[PDB]
Each structure stands twice: as C-alpha cells, then as structure tokens.
RNA sequence: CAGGCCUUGACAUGCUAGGGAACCCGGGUGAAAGCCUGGGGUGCCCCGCGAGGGGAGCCCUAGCACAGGUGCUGCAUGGCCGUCGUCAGCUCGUGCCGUGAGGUGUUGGGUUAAGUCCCGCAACGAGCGCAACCCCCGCCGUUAGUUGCCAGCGGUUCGGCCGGGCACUCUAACGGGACUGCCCGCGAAAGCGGGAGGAAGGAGGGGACGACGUCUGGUCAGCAUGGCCCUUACGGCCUGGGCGACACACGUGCUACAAUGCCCACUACAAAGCGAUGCCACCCGGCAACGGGGAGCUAAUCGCAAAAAGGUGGGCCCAGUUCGGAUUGGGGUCUGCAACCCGACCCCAUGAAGCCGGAAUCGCUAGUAAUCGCGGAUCAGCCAUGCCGCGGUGAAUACG
C-alpha cells in the first residue's frame, strides 16, 4: 500500500505528501514517513539573442521532484478516506501494493 | 539592448506561472500546444473585454481555464450565454471538459498589461504619445501604487526617425527580487509601422 | 568501543571509527597500505594521531565513497581528527594550530558559458 | 602473403585501373587530390604538396 | 597517441571498441 | 519558402528519413527541442512569460 | 531582375530565379 | 559500403529498362537519374545517360566498371583550374 | 542550380454552379511529381408497404473574392541581443547662484569592491544604479528512512545476501550560523591593522542580476511590422546537383614531434545527466565493427557504465623509433528508400609531415592554469576535434 507523487514544484509536492501521511495517520496504523527521492533535473541552454551572438547564453532548468510514502496497515477506512482528498494541480500520483 | 524580463526573473519568488500542471516527457509538449492555442482564442476573442491573465490548470483529461477580464460583463454575456458559446467553442479545440471561470479585476489601473493596452490604443487612435504616457503613470500612482514606468518605442508621431519615449514615477527597483513588479506588453499598429508599449507597475515588496 | 568522525574533502566522504589496539588501519575491507599502495601522499591521512602521539594506541576501521583517492585522504585526515577529539575534547588545542579541525572547502569551480573551462578563456586576435 | 615488390605492383595496378575507367577516384588521382571526401578549400597538404603561394585581391587604398 | 585508432588509446578517444580495446 | 514548408513538415512523407522537427510556434527549422516542440527563441520567449510549466531560469 | 543578392542590374532586384 | 546481407542496390525502374533491351535485342541510349544505382553485369555494352545535375552524360559500360555506381562516371563540378 | 511538372494553388477565410461526394484499397504512364485513371459506398431531418427527391460533416471539377513570396529596405520599425561595462556612474524635485547656456547638490578631507560609508558644506531630500532579498557550494540541526545506508548481535550459497536497524553515509525540504558581534591598537567618525572563538572572517568561494545612455552596432532569414516589388510566377510539387568546389590567404581548434614517454596484461577511486519502435544486463557466432538470441527497468531499484590520468607487472633503449598517425590499396559492418558526388565505425596493408616552431602573439592570480576522462542538447546516422556541463589530479608567481 504505497504512493509516489511527482511535481515540478516541491511546495505543492511536499504539501500533499503530508496531507496523505496524516490521513492514514487518522485511520492508522503504520504510516512510513515521506521519503525525499532524488530530484531529476532537465536543463536547456539557449543562445540569448535571436542571431549570431554565440557567447551569450541563458540557462533554464525543469525539476521533477519525488516523494514516496508507505502505509503498512490498510484500514479500509483510509482505502476509502484517501480517494476523496485535496490534491492540487501541480502533482501526479501512483499507488502501489 | 540589455535588461531581463521582470516576470521571468521572479518565477518562484514574486510570480506564479500561467499554466500549472505536471506532465511526463511523453506529452508535456502536446499539452503546451493546447494551452498556447487556448490563449490564442481568448486573447483573440476576449480582447474587447480587456484581458489580463489566462490561468490554465490541469489534472487529467480535463482543464480549468481562468480568465482575468476587466469588464466581466462582456465575458459572461446576456445571461450566461456568451460565456457558454465560448465554453462550447473551447471544447471544439480542447476536446476535454473545458471548465471556464471568470475572475474579477482588483483595480484595472494596477494591471500593467491593462495600462499597456490602454496606451497602445491611445497611440493607435492618434493621441499625443508623450501626454498619454504621463497620464497613464498618473492614474497608476493615484491608484495607490508604489511606482510606475511606461515606455514607448517606434515612429512616434509618425516621425521617420524612430525614438524612445518614457515616463516614470515613484520607484521601480528591477534589481530587487522582493519587489512585486507587474509587467505587461502591448503592441500598437499604425499606418506607418508598429510601436511597442511596456508598462511597469510596482505593487510593493514582500 | 568506538569514537566516530565524518570526513569530507571535495565530493569525497569518509567514515572513521577510531578503536584502540596496535595500529591496524583498514579502508573498505581492503587494508590501508593496500588501498593506497604507491600513492605517496598516503601517510598524510594519519597525521592527526601523530600530533597527539595516538599512533600505536589506536586502530581504525574506515569507509570511503566519492571523489578520488586523494580527496579520500584529506577526508580521512579530517574524520580521524574529528573522531580523535570526539574521544576527548582536550585534544582540541594542538589540533587547531594545524588546521585539523577545519574543512578544506575548495571545490571544482563550474564551467561558464563563453569559456573553455571556468576561467580559461578562448583565444583572441584583433583581426 | 604477397609483399614488398608484388604488393606495390598490385597497389599500382589498382590505382591505374580506377583512372583508366574514368571514375571519380580516378580523376582525383590525375589531379592528385584527396580521394576520400576531404575538404580541399583549406588543407590537403599531404596530398597537394608544398604551398604554392600566389598573389591576392589588392585592398583598396585610401584616399 | 589518441589519433591512432590502432591502439587502446585511440579507441578511448573515438570512444569505440574492437580488437584493440574490447569490452 | 515558408508557409509551404510549415505545411510540408506536417505531411507524412515518402520515407521516414524526410521527417524533421519544426517549431510549432514560429516554424523555425533549426534549434528545435523535441520536449517542448519549440525553437530556442520561442522557448525563451514563453519561458520568461511563465507560460511554461515548472520551467525556471536555472543558476548555480 | 529577380530575387535577392547579388543584383541583376535593376533597383532592388537580384539574380536568383 | 552497403551491408552485403542486404541487396545489391539498383532502383528497379532502371534495371527493367535494361532487361527489356537485352531481351528484344538492345541497345537504345538509356537515360536516368539514378546516380545511386550500382553497375550490374547485365548493363555491360550499353550506354547510360546519367544526369549530372545539369545534363545527361553518355556513359559506355565495360566489364571493369562493374563494382561502381553510375554517379562515379559523371562528375558534377566543372573545374579546369584557377590561373 | 538544371530539368520535368501545378495554377483559387501546399495553407486560411467566404461566395456561387455541377457532381452529389465522404473515406479506404488498386491500375497505366513517368526519375518522381504530375497527367490519365477503378472501384465500391455516408449519415443528417425528412413525405417512406412508394418511385424516391431534397437538405447536411467533408471530398472533387470549373469559377470568383483571396491565399503565397527566406524577393528589397535593420537608413522607416517592434521585439530580442551584442558592446563600452558589473564600470561607479546617470539624474530628478524644491531652494540657492548666473542676463543665459549652465552651475550648485554629485565638489571637497577621510574610507570602501562601490555616488560604500563617515565628516565638512547654499543646500535639503528623492529616483535609476552599488549592496540586499533569489540560487549552487562549505559546518551544524529538525523532519523524514525506500529503490539509499550497514554501527553493533542472528543467520549467510559469503553479495547488506536474509533477520533486523535508520546510528552513520546519502538523498531533499525547512531552519541555524559571520555581524567587523568580542579583545587589543590607530582614528573626529567611517573604517583600517592584529588577535580569540569558530566549519567558515572581513562581501567565505561561485552564480543569477547589467544604470541614463553609446555605437543610424546586429537581426525584414525565428517572429512581428510600414512602405516598395512579383501573380500559369520572384508562388507550389518533384527528381538530380550544389551548400562538401581549391593556384591560394586568415581565424578558432584537434593530434603530435617523445623516455616526466609509448605499448601490453592485471588492479583500483568520481560527479552530473540520458533512458518503454528507449538503456540494453547476460549467453552464444565473429580477430572486430556488429549479429542473433535474451532477463531486468515506466527507473536512488534495471541499464548506458569500463571512468581515464593513477597503482603493479613486464616490453621498448634515444632510432623519424614499438615516437607520430596523415595519406593511399584491399576487405567488411551498421543507420538509412538510398551512403558516386558526400556518412560514422571495424580489420589487414600502407606508415607522410613533424627533432619543439621567423617577425609576431593568446590565456590564466587557486581547487585557478595545465593534464585526465565522463555526460547532455541536436540527432536515423554522422563528418563533434564544436558547444553547454561534470568531476579526478593539481602547480608556478605577484617585487612593484
Ligand atoms: Mg566560440
Ligand atoms: Mg498608403
Ligand atoms: Mg552535495
Ligand atoms: Mg576540471
Ligand atoms: Mg573576435
Ligand atoms: Mg570536399
Ligand atoms: Mg588616387
Ligand atoms: Mg532529418
Ligand atoms: Mg529541426
Ligand atoms: Mg557571389
Ligand atoms: Mg539600428
Ligand atoms: Mg532594433
Ligand atoms: Mg546588413
Ligand atoms: Mg561619465
Ligand atoms: Mg535644480
Ligand atoms: Mg534667477
Ligand atoms: Mg540645474
Ligand atoms: Mg554633500
Ligand atoms: Mg558624477
Ligand atoms: Mg557628475
Ligand atoms: Mg554637476
Ligand atoms: Mg563642480
Ligand atoms: Mg564594484
Ligand atoms: Mg533521524
Ligand atoms: Mg545587485
Ligand atoms: Mg547600420
Ligand atoms: Mg520578415
Ligand atoms: Mg518587411
Ligand atoms: Mg521553389
Ligand atoms: Mg530536392
Ligand atoms: Mg558550411
Ligand atoms: Mg598559416
Ligand atoms: Mg577542431
Ligand atoms: Mg554513452
Ligand atoms: Mg616513418
Ligand atoms: Mg625530415
Ligand atoms: Mg612508428
Ligand atoms: Mg604506435
Ligand atoms: Mg576502403
Ligand atoms: Mg555519402
Ligand atoms: Mg628524437
Ligand atoms: Mg612552444
Ligand atoms: Mg606552435
Ligand atoms: Mg582576477
Ligand atoms: Mg595527452
Ligand atoms: Mg562528449
Ligand atoms: Mg548524436
Ligand atoms: Mg569528413
Ligand atoms: Zn519558434
């Protein structure tokens, strides 16, 4: 009973990692606190000008962060509770066995 | 030509994106087109309302466009019927369930993107450029702002020699990241070329 | 039992466990004088326990990952200096006059766009 | 294997062949230019030989 | 030297394998 | 030779080797990222605008 | 008298096509 | 060079123009745009007009021009030296 | 560029008249494009036991309005960039001085990386800049504990493999921490010299950030855009060629001329990234490129992946050489409709110049220069020795 969450901004990710943990800490028991997996980063280097000025570039990153959380004891009061929660738009969720 | 985009410079600090979602490598881009195509329609159709910020939220197989219009009377139309014929027009591009809010404007004289369009239209309508800039910057500071800067560039008055004209009041610290600078751009077509209009409103810091 | 210290120099992280005995030192299951065979800067990692004559007093079990063998040496020399004083805090003096308590924070400066390296710049010719 | 003298003879017979049929590599061998698609604007010294410097386009004067 | 495809040094340079730098 | 080639990129071609990326915003045939479908210019334009999810001027 | 640089001898026009 | 596991390459549309001639007693002056075609041992004795980007160069084929592509026998740049 | 082709056109809006379609599988010619073609069979609301005839996604034939132009003008323009220059500067409001342009402030003594800050003053304040808030790195804490870790006991096919545990290492989010705060010494003060604590000291190292302006700087070929220009063609499709030419000259680089080196075998130590017609473990065929089989991974788990300089061992013996690896012959491999022009790679053979570079000239002040390898974007493949990053090893010198 495992969930992994993914997003381009931590402060959304870190937020819905909590509000998941606690919900099964509401209908317990064992909830394995949110691990911070390593951040996978995708960069873009770009000629700053539209033409010919090659030694002037500007950088850009795109970070997907990664939080994993484990609930050891199902309690079908949370395999119910969770389905209706508050997961904002910046995040994606996968659920495991 | 030197200075960096004031908004691009404060994403993650003073400014939020205009699209919020995650998508995997396999179709981040496809979404991106819809978004750009979306604002295409709305900035096209809802210019007359005075459009200021299209906020596009995504979760999965649906969408929530939030339009920030100065006169929401034009958006919703005669009895939830305009906003409908467009919420229907959006499905024909989106395909997905296109959920469309209309959000009020705080004070239009504090929307840098608005000011820009108001000035660009005045220069589009043959008004004195220098005057229109001093007037615009007055109306902002009166609306309780902490600084304002408007910049016109092009064949002002139709002058063959292109020129830069600007006016600034209060304070505008573009090097300060805790400063909250609403930036906006408007383009103004004329019989003799095009003019760019940049409007800077300083809304206070954090 | 054990007096521990963490060590770091330059992406290299080492974990030191000072224990009493004859003097046997060991890094990653391989012996010390094995692991650093030939690398003439080896004796340098052990210099902390000579400033307190702890040489033949102790043994050391160690782990290293990150960097290279030299960065590991300066790491070990740090963690052992930290393990030593986290065996008794009177050792602090006579270990600070010799920079043993401080971390060598020199690191690989990043390469900058418009250059060949960090500061090495491309070659010029007016015309 | 075949060697010193005969190996040269076979090399020389191959090159000879290419030129006689009139193919591209054969024409590169008459003009003695590079054969394997190198640039010729600005190297080929192994294949071209010592630089035969010639005069250039005269820079206009002032005044 | 690294220009010499016919050695382990040249192969590392051109980043390939063969008789002279197998994997 | 612009619009006819914006169209001709979309076509599916006699051979798959004749398929090239073009910017979906401006139509540039050079320096196009497959991740965005954008050229390096447009990329930088929409980036500074915030219209690019989770994209952010890196600095380190 | 046609497209782009170099000029074909008529104002504005060049040699291409 | 092409993988000999794969097929020795002719465009097919030029090879049929040949075999017919062989059959109904060759030879007409055959013109093509397939510089990339390989000289095939059937072709010997014919002359093939290969386009050089500008014109169709007459090429008479002989037993020893066999390994090659037809483009090897109609060069594309005219040079004749500086001076 | 040459040739062969289309003319409301490759694409957008809208109007007509006909077929009455839609769309998906063919055939003849031709390098293809194109031209000529052959099939079947569409709702939609309808008067329907009826013959059926309308109307409507959208196709096609003609015919208009129009599309198209990477054709010109960057000296008509927007946007964005270069640059002087991260240089310490540019100004405004009111007052005061001057007939006036202007001055004052911003000058002056001291100080600072700095119009930084102190004192002085017909000036008093304010804005754009500097600094600060953002990011990476260096010490510590909290929060976490799997796919990551293994301190101390239990197994153990001896691999953290299993029990187990989250101490530690790490990962990644929120905080702390340095302030010229303290001691002395100079001084009007700002600060400056030195010391102590401390991981770090005087802005700790690095980044992002670029003032009013300059250069009628760059870009009408990314895009936008005024004006000029083309209209069976300066538009559009195609096959091929060219962008890869070569008496020559210049720039930026790669590899070297060797013994502080070159070669073979064995054996160690990184970091940042990429990866479900992708990374390819592993097994076999092949001297090899590669090929066939073939597990695992939506990836802190599986893979790219071996890092290389190093260390150990042997070989060379100062030779144009076992230095150097261009050039050419031959034989293969893969990608791709296709490698003639004009691809990378593999193996046999070949084995050029080069013995440290004339006048001249470039870079770097520390984890820097030099040296060593690794990754990514683009991309079928690749001419990348380029570029943007990553860590390994690690100097010399600064009198002035
Ligand atoms: Mg360069
Ligand atoms: Mg007119
Ligand atoms: Mg770190
Ligand atoms: Mg380095
Ligand atoms: Mg230059
Ligand atoms: Mg060439
Ligand atoms: Mg004269
Ligand atoms: Mg391609
Ligand atoms: Mg492309
Ligand atoms: Mg010319
Ligand atoms: Mg200009
Ligand atoms: Mg301009
Ligand atoms: Mg020009
Ligand atoms: Mg000045
Ligand atoms: Mg004044
Ligand atoms: Mg007066
Ligand atoms: Mg004055
Ligand atoms: Mg003063
Ligand atoms: Mg001044
Ligand atoms: Mg001054
Ligand atoms: Mg003055
Ligand atoms: Mg003065
Ligand atoms: Mg400074
Ligand atoms: Mg803990
Ligand atoms: Mg600053
Ligand atoms: Mg000019
Ligand atoms: Mg243009
Ligand atoms: Mg134009
Ligand atoms: Mg054309
Ligand atoms: Mg063509
Ligand atoms: Mg070129
Ligand atoms: Mg020269
Ligand atoms: Mg190079
Ligand atoms: Mg690789
Ligand atoms: Mg020799
Ligand atoms: Mg000689
Ligand atoms: Mg030799
Ligand atoms: Mg050799
Ligand atoms: Mg060959
Ligand atoms: Mg080729
Ligand atoms: Mg010698
Ligand atoms: Mg020298
Ligand atoms: Mg030299
Ligand atoms: Mg310096
Ligand atoms: Mg070397
Ligand atoms: Mg590389
Ligand atoms: Mg590639
Ligand atoms: Mg080449
Ligand atoms: Zn673009």
Curated annotation (Swiss-Prot), chain A:
Gene3D superfamilies: Ribosomal protein S10 domain. It comes from the Bacteria. GO terms for molecular function: rRNA binding; structural constituent of ribosome; tRNA binding. Keywords: Ribonucleoprotein, Ribosomal protein, RNA-binding, rRNA-binding. SUPFAM superfamilies: Ribosomal protein S10 (SSF54999). Involved in the binding of tRNA to the ribosomes. Part of the top of the 30S subunit head. NCBIfam families: PRK00596.1 (NF001861), rpsJ_bact (TIGR01049). Part of the 30S ribosomal subunit. Forms a tight complex with proteins S3 and S14. Also contacts protein S9. This is Small ribosomal subunit protein uS10. The gene is rpsJ.
UniProtKB/Swiss-Prot annotation, chain D:
It comes from Thermus thermophilus (strain ATCC 27634 / DSM 579 / HB8). The keyword Ribosomal protein applies. Residues 32-63 are annotated as: Disordered. Keywords: Ribonucleoprotein, Ribosomal protein, RNA-binding, rRNA-binding, tRNA-binding. GO terms for molecular function: rRNA binding; structural constituent of ribosome; tRNA binding. Part of the 30S ribosomal subunit. Forms a loose heterodimer with protein S19. Forms two bridges to the 50S subunit in the 70S ribosome, contacting protein L5 and the 23S rRNA; these bridges are straddled by the 5S rRNA. The chain holds residues 64 to 126 of 126 of the full protein. GO terms for biological process: translation. Belongs to the universal ribosomal protein uS13 family. The lineage of its organism: Bacteria, Thermotogati, Deinococcota, Deinococci, Thermales. This is Small ribosomal subunit protein uS13. Located at the top of the head of the 30S subunit, it contacts several helices of the 16S rRNA. In the 70S ribosome structure it contacts the 23S rRNA (bridge B1a) and protein L5 of the 50S subunit (bridge B1b), connecting the top of the two subunits; these bridges are in contact with the A site and P site tRNAs respectively and are implicated in movement during ribosome translocation. Separately contacts the tRNAs in the A and P sites. GO terms for cellular component: cytosol; small ribosomal subunit. The keyword Zinc does not apply.
From Swiss-Prot, chain E:
Keywords: Ribonucleoprotein, Ribosomal protein, RNA-binding, rRNA-binding. Residues 1-23 are annotated as: Disordered. The keyword Transit peptide does not apply. One of its GO terms (molecular function) is rRNA binding. InterPro entries: Ribosomal_bTHX, Ribosomal_bTHX/bTHXc/bTHXm. One of its GO terms (cellular component) is ribonucleoprotein complex. Binds at the top of the head of the 30S subunit. It stabilizes a number of different RNA elements and thus is important for subunit structure. Belongs to the bacterial ribosomal protein bTHX family. NCBIfam families: PRK14753.1, ribo_THX. Part of the 30S ribosomal subunit. This is Small ribosomal subunit protein bTHX. It comes from Thermus thermophilus (strain ATCC 27634 / DSM 579 / HB8). The lineage of its organism: Bacteria, Thermotogati, Deinococcota, Deinococci, Thermales.
From Swiss-Prot, chain F:
GO terms for cellular component: cytoplasm; small ribosomal subunit. SUPFAM superfamilies: Glucocorticoid receptor-like (DNA-binding domain). PROSITE patterns: RIBOSOMAL_S14. Disulfide bonds: none annotated. Its cofactor is Zn(2+). One of its GO terms (molecular function) is rRNA binding. InterPro entries: Ribosomal_uS14, Ribosomal_uS14_bact, Ribosomal_uS14_CS, Ribosomal_uS14_sf. Zn(2+) binds at residues 23, 26, 39, 42. GO terms for biological process: translation. Binds 1 zinc ion per subunit. Gene3D superfamilies: 30s Ribosomal Protein S14, Chain N. Keywords: Metal-binding, Ribonucleoprotein, Ribosomal protein, RNA-binding, rRNA-binding, Zinc. Pfam families: Ribosomal_S14. Belongs to the universal ribosomal protein uS14 family. Zinc-binding uS14 subfamily. Part of the 30S ribosomal subunit. Forms a tight complex with proteins S3 and S10, which cover it. Required for the assembly of 30S particles and may also be responsible for determining the conformation of the 16S rRNA at the A site. Binds 16S rRNA in center of the 30S subunit head. This is Small ribosomal subunit protein uS14. It comes from Thermus thermophilus (strain ATCC 27634 / DSM 579 / HB8). The lineage of its organism: Bacteria, Thermotogati, Deinococcota, Deinococci, Thermales.
């Amino acid at each position: 009973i495992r969930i992994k969450l993914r997003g381009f901004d931590h402060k959304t990710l870190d937020a819905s990692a909590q509000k998941i943990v606690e919900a099964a800490r509401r209908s317990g028991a064992q909830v394995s606190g949110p691990i911070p997996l390593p951040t996978r980063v995708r960069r873009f280097t770009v000629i700053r000008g539209p033409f010919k000025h090659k030694d002037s570039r500007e950088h850009f990153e795109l970070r997907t962060h990664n939080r994993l959380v484990d609930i050891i004891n199902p309690n079908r009061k949370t395999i119910e509770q969770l389905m209706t929660l508050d997961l904002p738009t910046g995040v994606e969720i996968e659920i495991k066995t | 030509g030197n200075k960096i985009h004031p908004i691009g410079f404060r994403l993650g600090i003073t400014r939020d994106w205009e699209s919020r979602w995650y998508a995997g490598k396999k179709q981040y881009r496809h979404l991106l087109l819809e978004d750009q195509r979306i604002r295409g329609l709305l900035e096209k159709e809802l210019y007359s309302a005075g459009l200021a910020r299209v906020d596009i939220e995504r979760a999965a197989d649906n969408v929530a466009v939030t339009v920030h219009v100065a006169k929401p009377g034009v958006v919703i139309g005669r009895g939830g019927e305009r906003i409908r014929v467009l919420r229907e027009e959006l499905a024909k591009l989106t395909g997905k369930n296109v959920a469309l809010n209309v959000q009020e404007v705080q004070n239009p004289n504090l929307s840098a993107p608005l000011v820009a369009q108001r000035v660009a239209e005045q220069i589009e309508r043959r008004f004195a450029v220098r005057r229109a800039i001093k007037q615009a910057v007055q109306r902002v500071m009166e609306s309780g702002a902490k600084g304002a800067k408007v910049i016109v560039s092009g064949r002002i008055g139709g002058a063959e020699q292109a020129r830069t004209e600007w006016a600034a009041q209060g304070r505008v610290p573009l090097h300060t990241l805790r400063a909250n600078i609403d930036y906006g751009f408007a383009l103004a077509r004329t019989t003799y070329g095009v003019l760019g209009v940049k409007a800077y409103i300083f809304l206070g810091e954090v | 039992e054990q007096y521990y210290g963490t060590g770091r120099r330059k992406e290299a992280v080492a974990r030191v466990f000072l224990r009493p005995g004859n003097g046997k030192v060991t890094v990653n299951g391989q012996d010390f004088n094995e692991y650093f065979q030939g690398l003439v800067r080896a004796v340098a990692a052990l210099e902390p326990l000579r400033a307190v004559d702890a040489l033949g007093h102790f043994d050391a079990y160690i782990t290293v990952r990150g960097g290279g063998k030299s960065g590991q040496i300066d790491a070990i020399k740090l963690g052992i200096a930290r393990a030593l004083v986290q065996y008794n805090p009177d050792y602090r003096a006579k270990l600070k006059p010799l920079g043993f308590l401080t971390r060598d924070a020199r690191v690989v400066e990043r390469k900058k766009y418009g250059k060949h390296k960090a500061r090495r710049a491309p070659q010029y010719s007016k015309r | 294997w075949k060697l010193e003298g005969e190996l040269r003879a076979e090399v020389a017979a191959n090159i000879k062949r290419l030129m006689d049929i009139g193919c591209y590599r054969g024409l590169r061998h008459r003009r003695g230019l590079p054969v394997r698609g190198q640039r010729t604007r600005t190297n080929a010294r192994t294949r071209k030989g010592p630089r035969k410097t010639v005069a250039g386009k005269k820079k206009a004067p002032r005044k | 030297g690294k220009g010499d495809r016919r050695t382990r040094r040249g192969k590392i340079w051109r980043g390939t394998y063969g008789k002279y730098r197998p994997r | 030779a612009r619009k006819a080639l914006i169209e001709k990129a979309k076509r599916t071609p006699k051979f798959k080797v004749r398929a090239y990326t073009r910017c979906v915003r401006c139509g540039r045939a050079r320096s196009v990222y497959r991740f965005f479908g954008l050229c390096r210019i447009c990329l930088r334009e929409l980036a500074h605008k915030g219209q690019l999810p989770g994209v952010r001027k890196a600095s380190w | 008298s046609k497209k782009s640089k170099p000029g074909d001898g008529k104002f504005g026009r060049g040699v291409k096509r | 060079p092409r993988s000999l596991k794969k097929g020795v390459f002719v465009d097919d549309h030029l090879l049929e123009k040949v075999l017919e001639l062989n059959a109904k007693g060759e030879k007409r002056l055959i013109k093509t745009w397939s510089r990339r075609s390989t000289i095939v041992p059937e072709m010997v004795g014919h002359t093939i007009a290969v386009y050089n980007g500008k014109q169709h160069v007459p090429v008479y084929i002989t037993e020893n021009m066999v390994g090659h592509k037809l483009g090897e026998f109609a060069p594309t740049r005219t040079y004749r030296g500086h001076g």
